[PDB]
Amino acid sequence: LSDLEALRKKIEEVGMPEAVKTKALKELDRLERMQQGSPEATVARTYLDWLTEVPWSKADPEVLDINHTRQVLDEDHYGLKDVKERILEYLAVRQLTQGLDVRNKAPILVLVGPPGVGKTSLGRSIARSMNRKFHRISLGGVRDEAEIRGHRRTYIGAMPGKLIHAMKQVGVINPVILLDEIDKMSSDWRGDPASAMLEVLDPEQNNTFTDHYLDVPYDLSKVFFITTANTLQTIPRPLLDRMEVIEIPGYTNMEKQAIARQYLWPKQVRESGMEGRIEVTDAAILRVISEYTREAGVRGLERELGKIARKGAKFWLEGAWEGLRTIDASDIPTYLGIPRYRPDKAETEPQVGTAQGLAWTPVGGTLLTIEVAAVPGSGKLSLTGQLGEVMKESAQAALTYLRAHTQDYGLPEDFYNKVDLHVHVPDGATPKDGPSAGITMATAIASALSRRPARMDIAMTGEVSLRGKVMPIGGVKEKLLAAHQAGIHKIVLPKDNEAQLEELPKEVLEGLEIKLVEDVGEVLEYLLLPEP
Amino acid sequence: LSDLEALRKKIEEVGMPEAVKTKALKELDRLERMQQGSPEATVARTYLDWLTEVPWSKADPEVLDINHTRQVLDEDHYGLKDVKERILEYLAVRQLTQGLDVRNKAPILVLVGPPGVGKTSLGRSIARSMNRKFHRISLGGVRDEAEIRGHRRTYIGAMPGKLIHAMKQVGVINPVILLDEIDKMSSDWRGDPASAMLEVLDPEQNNTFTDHYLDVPYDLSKVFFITTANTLQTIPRPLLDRMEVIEIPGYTNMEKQAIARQYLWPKQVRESGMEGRIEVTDAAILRVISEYTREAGVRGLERELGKIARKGAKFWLEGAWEGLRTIDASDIPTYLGIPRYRPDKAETEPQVGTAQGLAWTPVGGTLLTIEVAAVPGSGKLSLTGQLGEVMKESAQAALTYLRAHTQDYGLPEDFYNKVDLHVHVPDGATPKDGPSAGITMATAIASALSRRPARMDIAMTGEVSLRGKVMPIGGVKEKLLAAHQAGIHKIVLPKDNEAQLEELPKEVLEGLEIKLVEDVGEVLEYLLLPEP
Numbered sequence A, B: 001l002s003d004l005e006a007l008r009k010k011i012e013e014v015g016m017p018e019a020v021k022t023k024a025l026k027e028l029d030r031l032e033r034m035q036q037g038s039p040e041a042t043v044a045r046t047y048l049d050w051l052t053e054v055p056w057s058k059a060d061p062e063v064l065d066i067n068h069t070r071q072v073l074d075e076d077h078y079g080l081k082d083v084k085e086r087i088l089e090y091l092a093v094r095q096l097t098q099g100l101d102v103r104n105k106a107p108i109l110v111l112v113g114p115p116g117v118g119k120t121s122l123g124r125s126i127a128r129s130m131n132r133k134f135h136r137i138s139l140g141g142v143r144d145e146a147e148i149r150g151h152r153r154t155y156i157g158a159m160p161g162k163l164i165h166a167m168k169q170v171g172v173i174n175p176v177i178l179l180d181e182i183d184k185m186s187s188d189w190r191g192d193p194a195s196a197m198l199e200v201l202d203p204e205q206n207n208t209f210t211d212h213y214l215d216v217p218y219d220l221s222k223v224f225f226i227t228t229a230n231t232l233q234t235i236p237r238p239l240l241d242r243m244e245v246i247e248i249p250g251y252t253n254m255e256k257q258a259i260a261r262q263y264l265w266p267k268q269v270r271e272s273g274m275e276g277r278i279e280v281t282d283a284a285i286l287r288v289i290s291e292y293t294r295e296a297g298v299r300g301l302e303r304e305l306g307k308i309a310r311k312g313a314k315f316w317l318e319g320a321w322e323g324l325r326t327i328d329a330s331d332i333p334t335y336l337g338i339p340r341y342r343p344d345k346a347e348t349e350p351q352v353g354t355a356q357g358l359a360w361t362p363v364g365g366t367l368l369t370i371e372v373a374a375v376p377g378s379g380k381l382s383l384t385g386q387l388g389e390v391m392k393e394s395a396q397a398a399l400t401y402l403r404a405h406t407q408d409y410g411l412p413e414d415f416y417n418k419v420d421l422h423v424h425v426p427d428g429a430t431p432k433d434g435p436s437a438g439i440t441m442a443t444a445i446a447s448a449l450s451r452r453p454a455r456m457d458i459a460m461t462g463e464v465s466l467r468g469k470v471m472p473i474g475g476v477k478e479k480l481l482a483a484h485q486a487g488i489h490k491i492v493l494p495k496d497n498e499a500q501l502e503e504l505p506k507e508v509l510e511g512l513e514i515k516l517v518e519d520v521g522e523v524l525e526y527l528l529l530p531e532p
């Protein structure tokens, strides 16, 4: 058949390394036989063709100016203005490398947070600065060690791997390969998939990687590696090491507006066809964020502005009555549709014994509207919502703290023998480890016992102390972003976290009011309209 | 067939016993047809890889010296002088035996200690001592009995256990193999992999060690073993015999400075790419240690010093401003984050109703900030923290002591019928079982009932009696080190442990000022000094 001759002519001209030349000889030996009566060799032909187009002795060196590299990364989907410094930190590390040559010998980089952020655009900016050919292969669709490796040409089911797929359509021997959804691979075949992942991620062992489908070494040392994380608590332990975690949660109103004005909306109208006949203002984006998408990231905003751009394209195609289409938070029902959420979510007829608190999930922050039913009984505790045991410990701690004050809060003679508690949480299984809303449901119980109207729009995070203290907590930036996105402008935090606030985005501080407390007494006094 | 030729020679020059030569020749016939002719060809090739690439009859020169190893322990590490002596004991015992004498009933080392306290480093120092190759193999994350061994050698697609590949890595029969994290071995399969590790970790049976993948009982008699274990409680009893425990608790603050100055700081400086143009004062080292790390050892220190090196890569890369830049304690947050830990615990401003306990949690030493409350009720004790009932017993013992000693603490003569005690313990459970914090709870309850603040700068440990007589407690060194790593240098100890003040090195008693007590009266005299 002409296939053998074509493959021989494709192999015999490309300059190839000796071991890979011998592997090409092996594959050419396989394809000696018929390629039409047995399709088990056609996939070998596809693998060879992907291997033929692998670049060799041709690479794009990075720009040696770290300052110019930062200048190029300044267009990485706007980043966060506080996460880019660690990226360019690793880049500067890559400017005084070990042995004065291109090699990692260290954790490379990672993006942790909600999937809606611009994970791919930042890697594209990295490639643009470094001049290498960007490419990505998603590992979320890979659940077995058979799509980064293969299945040797001796039985049916030898589909090509994703590694050579990235190696195929690339012009540089050292590309940047992005691996999204790294926290969903389980054990299905050939043991733990993370073992091969850590074998690849090694800067010295990647060159010594022999797949299930390959029998010779393959050059991967200089190839830059990059991954993306969604939930840090699900990634396998052999993947938590040799990995510099860069916390990149969602964006504020101002960050999202800048992304839309610089990266999102022009690209969306690129995807929708024509340009110069639509316009999106800051007020429209703010209203959409505050009324249509409360999640974290811009992918939902990507879809929304894509819908708006497609609509405007249809309006222009059906008749150009206006030079450009503008949205000013008044004609948005035609552009997008009926609103789904409620602006100012705290404006839900504030009841007597309910409080609101932050609970930053890795997919997006939420407000915990925990209600406490202080029915007059003889002392009971009904804890619903599937809440963790630490949440119950925090609840009992709040109970005894409220016990510590008899008549200060206008409480009755007793409630341990007179009040039955039925505490409900919108989702008790809080992904945030430890007590995330202990002070919140403490305030809820106090309101249910004092029986006075409570303040809304103040979302909280932290825990209580039996003598009236609050301890500092980690991940305050993510919860502050959750409050900013969820229409919350007042946040109560412990004093001890304030020293950590000098490394936060200025837009978060501008958009939020922070009133610090040291004791549960203050946070209880400032959340009920009357002190008693 | 070139592959068949290569496999045939690989059989030839490698010297296996004729019992294995029989298997080699019995697998020779399985390669009488090409790869696609039968999948048995691929599994035969894989088995030949697992057999004739694993070394046979090859041994590195064993070193049999015993003060040279003292130098090596001093060359690489700053010096333990407690663990080092016991390693000398084991090595000397191995030296006087292990010739032609079948006396190998000796236990295999287990280096029980928190993560990053000098175990793998100690392992590689030991390996260099006898000129043996080191291959860490982390067993953490293994729950399958057949992950240690192989599987059926009847189909292609399966790999042997960790041992076969791990010793395939080395080219000699006798490398040091540091088994790791043996405590997290769970049984999520048929039986417990504890026996699958006992068959290899005992010299009398692993000399004929058998795995599923291989059909020959391999000889592991000559292979040194050494096992890391963050926990001793969860080590299986079948794997607890023939075990000698070499405790390695955490380091000390001045030892931390010394290890940073001697090896850690130069290590990370050459790691980043810097070669002697950065100066770091000891004050900056201590600031890093006591403000940015609370883990026992150097792992956190390794990360922080890597951060220092990378920010130095910043501030020397863009120009050689200075020949030797000096970092004091003032500019350490210019290179790092905000100080996330306090300098010293003396600034705690003693709180009314809390006591500072001591324990050795197998992830690293830590305080037990046990807190309690005094609500006016009818008299009832409530444990909170999901600890054992033994802590409730200790609390009741302390309550009885106060009842018998009410004249000494100003309480009303009858409080057992008026106060309800909520003993909130922060952690879920403590490893150092029993009333290992009995005097801590005595202090906490005494402070709560009397409303007298307790000094939150003195870390303590010791049991109590129902009449009140503190008792000896095991692991006094553990409690002292846990107190030291909390920035605490004043410790209350039971006077019956006065014998446990000389066996400890002077490398631990630097700033710790032990104030021994024999009765609860003295330990409550040290703390409940203020009376507002």
Ligand SMILES: Nc1ncnc2c1ncn2[C@@H]1O[C@H](COP(=O)(O)OP(=O)(O)O)[C@@H](O)[C@H]1O
Pocket: B076, B077, B078, B079, B114, B115, B116, B117, B118, B119, B120, B121, B122, B123, B259, B263, B297, B298, B299
């Ligand atoms: N004397 C020492 N004390 C503490 N750490 C040391 C010492 N010497 C070297 N180290 C470093 O500590 C690191 C941690 O190793 P080790 O604690 O032995 O293993 P693990 O981190 O698994 O407990 C090693 O990489 C080593 O470079």
